[PDB]
Design a protein around this ligand. Sequence first.
Ligand SMILES: [Cl-]
Ligand SMILES: [Cl-]
Ligand SMILES: [Cl-]
Length: 129
Amino acid sequence: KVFGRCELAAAMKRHGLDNYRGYSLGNWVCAAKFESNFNTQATNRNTDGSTDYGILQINSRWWCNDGRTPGSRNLCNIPCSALLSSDITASVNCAKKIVSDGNGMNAWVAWRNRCKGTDVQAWIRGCRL
Ligand SMILES: [Cl-]
Ligand SMILES: [Cl-]
Ligand SMILES: [Cl-]
């Protein structure tokens, strides 16, 4: 599913991501924009052989099981395929664990490079939330 911008903001809020660990909704929408362009089915293969999955490009090295990332963990206790669903529940619940892991949203390199320090409220501007 490719979400609309406000549609995704609303879904993220519904699932308790708004201001989670102090990160406003615009941060999460911005991260999703640059990780996946709001496409739940996004996948990307990393140099180390792990894969990133879903709207927030969650990585199989630590967070989910895909059966093809040697030496990896599955800390969200989910198949990586669950992160590709039109229903963002699994991605949100896993993101909550990731952002709580110590480095906040810096876990998403894209957020650090493209969202951090910017006017992230622009991402939810106009949205009925
Ligand atoms: Cl915001
Ligand atoms: Cl594996
Ligand atoms: Cl980047």
